[PDB]
Design an enzyme around this catalytic site. Structure first.
Site, PDB file in Angstrom:
ATOM      1  CG  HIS A  85      -0.523  -0.038   2.887  1.00 41.22           C
ATOM      2  ND1 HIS A  85      -0.418  -0.820   3.492  1.00 41.22           N
ATOM      3  CD2 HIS A  85       0.021   1.195   3.108  1.00 41.22           C
ATOM      4  CE1 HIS A  85       0.081  -0.617   4.612  1.00 41.22           C
ATOM      5  NE2 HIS A  85       0.412   1.027   4.373  1.00 41.22           N
ATOM      6  CD  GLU A 121      17.853  10.876   6.188  1.00 37.51           C
ATOM      7  OE1 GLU A 121      17.970  11.482   7.077  1.00 37.51           O
ATOM      8  OE2 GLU A 121      17.565  11.659   4.978  1.00 37.51           O
ATOM      9  CG  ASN A 155      16.798  15.211  12.697  1.00 39.50           C
ATOM     10  OD1 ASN A 155      17.289  15.891  13.386  1.00 39.50           O
ATOM     11  ND2 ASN A 155      15.724  15.411  11.745  1.00 39.50           N
ATOM     12  CB  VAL A 187      19.331  17.577  10.260  1.00 40.40           C
ATOM     13  CG1 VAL A 187      20.843  18.393  10.520  1.00 40.40           C
ATOM     14  CG2 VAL A 187      18.422  18.550  11.027  1.00 40.40           C
ATOM     15  CD  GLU A 233      22.046  12.175   5.874  1.00 35.92           C
ATOM     16  OE1 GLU A 233      23.428  12.456   5.682  1.00 35.92           O
ATOM     17  OE2 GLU A 233      21.491  13.035   6.565  1.00 35.92           O
ATOM     18  CG  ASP A 244       0.093  -4.207   2.875  1.00 35.82           C
ATOM     19  OD1 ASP A 244       0.650  -3.452   1.809  1.00 35.82           O
ATOM     20  OD2 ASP A 244       0.010  -3.589   3.617  1.00 35.82           O
ATOM     21  N   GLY A 254       2.691   6.898   9.112  1.00 40.10           N
ATOM     22  CA  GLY A 254       4.185   7.027   8.821  1.00 40.10           C
ATOM     23  C   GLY A 254       5.015   6.031   9.105  1.00 40.10           C
ATOM     24  CB  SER A 269       2.645   1.528   6.203  1.00 38.51           C
ATOM     25  OG  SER A 269       1.515   1.507   6.882  1.00 38.51           O
ATOM     26  N   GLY A 270       5.377  -0.244   6.109  1.00 39.33           N
ATOM     27  CA  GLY A 270       6.552  -0.566   5.313  1.00 39.33           C
ATOM     28  C   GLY A 270       7.924  -0.983   6.174  1.00 39.33           C
TER      29      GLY A 270
END
Lengths: 56, 223
Positions: free
Chosen positions: B40, B52, B54, B57, B62, B84, B175, B177-178
């Site tokens: 989804h 990551e 933060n 910033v 990263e 899913d 936020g 999910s996954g």
């Protein structure tokens, strides 16, 4: 197209964070909300312009 | 993550952020070029951010890579959320190191009572919205299938597992999910759905990854 535009905003049960717009019937204007990615309902538009274009 | 703690930096090195302008779902790195996440969370342009801590910033650690292929499972059902899961192939392999690493796929299906660590940058409050800057973490157990079925009667398939606390107070939220649910160093679940966030008798339900290991393996192979 009105019936859609009266439905209360719904996140649905999924847990993504997608900003969407819904029409608010008391205030007569599209407001932003967070949609979870599945379920929810028709008062769920991708932009302000498209929301006011359907419901405003 | 409602009710969790900030993860020590770069302790969850396989956690990724799927981004399209803003963070919208999490994921897990399972090798140099593929990410696993929830179906989804599909969009057509996805950029994967690795290393990551933060999310707001630029920290210097990263890696930013665009998603070259996004393959959902063939039998994902958008109404029941059965199956899913989706794979993302990065446009180039990442550089693996102390704060960007892989997580092992399951050797078998973890039994009820196993403690898992769930992490994510999803909302932190049950009423209201508050998006953390820093990665949150949560230690929670896998529930007996019966408890899971009893909390969501008629809606749990063999491809789902519940983690959490029936008292509420803690749980994943929008936020997240996954994201990864890792139990005993293996990826056992992917954050998928629940009613509300951290509400009593509405635990978290996850895609049971151990049922998909041959699918993942065969899909990496074919492309």
């Amino acid at each position: 197209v009105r019936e859609v535009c009266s439905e209360q905003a719904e996140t649905g049960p999924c847990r993504a964070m997608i900003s969407r717009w819904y029409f608010d019937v008391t205030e007569g204007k599209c407001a932003p909300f967070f949609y979870g990615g599945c379920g929810g309902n028709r008062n769920n538009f991708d932009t302000e312009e498209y929301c006011m274009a359907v419901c405003g | 993550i409602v009710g969790g703690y900030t993860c020590q930096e770069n302790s969850v090195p396989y956690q990724v952020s799927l981004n399209s302008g803003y963070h919208f779902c999490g994921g897990s790195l399972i090798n140099d070029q593929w990410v696993v996440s929830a179906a989804h969370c599909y969009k057509s342009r996805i950029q994967v951010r690795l290393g990551e801590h933060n999310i707001n910033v630029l920290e210097g650690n990263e890696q930013f890579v665009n998603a070259a292929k996004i393959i959902k499972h063939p039998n994902f059902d958008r109404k029941t959320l059965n199956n899913d899961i989706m794979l993302i192939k990065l446009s180039s392999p990442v550089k693996l190191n102390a704060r960007v690493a892989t997580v092992a796929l399951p050797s078998s299906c973890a039994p009820a009572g196993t403690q898992c660590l769930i992490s994510g940058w999803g909302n932190t409050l049950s009423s209201g919205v508050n998006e953390p800057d820093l990665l949150q973490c949560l230690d929670a157990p896998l529930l007996p299938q019966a408890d899971c079925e009893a909390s969501y009667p008629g809606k749990i398939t063999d491809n789902m597992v519940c983690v959490g606390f029936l008292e509420g107070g803690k749980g994943s939220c929008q936020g997240d999910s996954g994201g990864p649910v890792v139990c005993n160093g293996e990826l056992q679940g992917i954050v998928s759905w629940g009613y509300g966030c951290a509400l009593p008798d509405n635990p978290d339900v996850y895609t049971k990854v151990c049922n998909y290991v041959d699918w993942i393996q065969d899909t990496i192979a074919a492309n």
